[PDB]
């Protein structure tokens, strides 16, 4: 057991400071709530279809958690109200259920976001309306229940144990179980949001794959300025002559290959050398089904013009095709064929990144959330472990403004974005 006093380290100064930041921020997150909630109610009153599950959750633990936290923060440390042991514990218990149910409602939307990406197909099976509607109203309850143990015997006076440095009448471990749901929940909406982030990066540039076999390099100086024209239309290109590749799937993981072979054999018709050992293993490789177009060299005065890219075409034909279009098929010199090899080019990837808008308020939301829990968290798991000073507890006052900011954005992240929400709004004006 302590003294009321040691934990209301604010001056006159850094009292009206505070007041400031708490009436502002909460006055406009009591307000910003109300209308996300008026306008989910005036959507369902008109069309049925769109959710707002994870939209009104987080507008009622936002509006509420705001509301209480306040009206306590101010009271305690303006007005320097002392209140009983477990008085004190239930205006307490009215932060940590909807700061909590707040946090919870975020995992809830991550959870969702991350199994639509994840499993698109498994996704409408596996996440249901009534799967969904138990989902909140279990974090609610869950929620609820870890900030109603102080108030029943899990709390430093009852329990003779360390107390909390920051928290009055609180027990060391109680906190530890808040920071260790609170973070575990928190870190998986940063890997969620990590997870879409990525797999969105991985799609922004389309994988190209140009193997071409040539002799005198004719086929070469014509894979290299096919090469540049698509490297140029923002492909992630990747050049291999045939006499260095692998036959173990070398086109695994490529949205566009092209296989250059250039047309040889004086009595018949004939590939080229270093495409030879690559052509017959084209079963170990994948090519399963795979956008594959063909080119190479050849020459009119011969009898079979450019039968190599036939005859590859033929055996690609048989497995996988998918031929995007019809073989370039260049004389002895692509010199003066320049504009043919760039026009085909052209065409060839006429025939087929990231919604930089969407993934750009997922970066936000990680930015917001690593500034408002990161250090706030921080000086929480310090009085963990160990004691703080006088700068430290004042340092965590400023700190607390900083989830009241949370509070503030989130109806301006989720809600505001809403297009269902955003026309069910315009709804409300005359016609
Ligand atoms: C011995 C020999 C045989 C050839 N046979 C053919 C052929 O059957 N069909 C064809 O279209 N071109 C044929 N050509 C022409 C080649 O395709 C031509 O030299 C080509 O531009 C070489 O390209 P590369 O440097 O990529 O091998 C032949 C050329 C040579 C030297
Ligand atoms: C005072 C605070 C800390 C305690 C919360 C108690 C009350 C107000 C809680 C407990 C049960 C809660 C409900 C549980 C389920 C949901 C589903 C969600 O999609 C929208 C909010 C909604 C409908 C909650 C609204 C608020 C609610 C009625
Ligand atoms: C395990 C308990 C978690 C508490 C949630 C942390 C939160 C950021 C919400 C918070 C809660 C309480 C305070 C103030 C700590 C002061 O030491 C005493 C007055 C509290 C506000 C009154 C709550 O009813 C806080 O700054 C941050």
Known sequence: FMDIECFMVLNPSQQLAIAVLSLTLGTFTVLENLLVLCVILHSRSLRCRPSYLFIGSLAVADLLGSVIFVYSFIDFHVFHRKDSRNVFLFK?????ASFTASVGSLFLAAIDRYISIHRPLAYKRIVTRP???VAFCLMWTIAIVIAVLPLLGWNCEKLQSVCSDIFPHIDKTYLMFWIGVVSVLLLFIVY?????????????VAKA?????????????????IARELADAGYEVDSRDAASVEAGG???????????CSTWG?????????????????????????????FG????????????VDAIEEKLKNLGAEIVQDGLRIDGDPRAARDDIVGWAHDVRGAIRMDIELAKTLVLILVVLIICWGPLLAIMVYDVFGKM???????????????????TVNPIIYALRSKDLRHAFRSMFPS
């Open 297 to 308: 060299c050849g020459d009119s005065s011969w009898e079979y013009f450019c039968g190599a």
């Open 92 to 96: 307490l218990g009215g932060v940590t």
């Open 209 to 225: 794959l140009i193997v071409y076999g040539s002799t005198t390099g004719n086929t070469e100086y014509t894979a290299e300025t």
């Open 266 to 294: 004086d009595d018949s018709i004939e590939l080229q050398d270093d495409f030879i050992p690559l052509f017959d293993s084209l079963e170990e490789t994948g090519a399963q089904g795979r956008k594959v177009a063909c």
């Open 192 to 204: 969620a949001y990590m997870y879409i982030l990525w797999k969105a990066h991985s799609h922004a």
């Open 131 to 133: 799967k969904a509607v």
């Open 250 to 260: 070398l086109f695994e993981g490529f949205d566009l290959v092209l296989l250059g």
């Open 389 to 407: 000073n006088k700068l430290i507890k004042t340092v965590f006052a400023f700190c607390s403004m900083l989830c009241l900011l949370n509070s």
